[PDB]
Symmetry: C2
Subunit: 57 residues, 2 copies
Amino acid sequence: TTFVALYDYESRTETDLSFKKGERLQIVNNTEGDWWLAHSLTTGETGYIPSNYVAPS
Amino acid sequence: TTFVALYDYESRTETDLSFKKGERLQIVNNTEGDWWLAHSLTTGETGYIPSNYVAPS
């Protein structure tokens, strides 16, 4: 599948991808899975996680 | 839903969340959507994108 950007996006880290509205993008499948923003109930810390590392309780 | 970490994970950026196997995590829903690793056919650049910014071709 090929996706099209609906908006401009500016990178904030060295790992994200900047792109302009209209750009054509392909998804890279890998062992991490989609990333999710998550909050640890164990430590109180918050940030993005690789979803293939977790499972529903 | 509450998720449980299956493995230890060490953060590589200032935005990801480090966690230990066993930690209980909740997902933060937001306007970005899941993040995906993507390759631009337009620029040749590669990195993570907020998926709510794109749509299938």
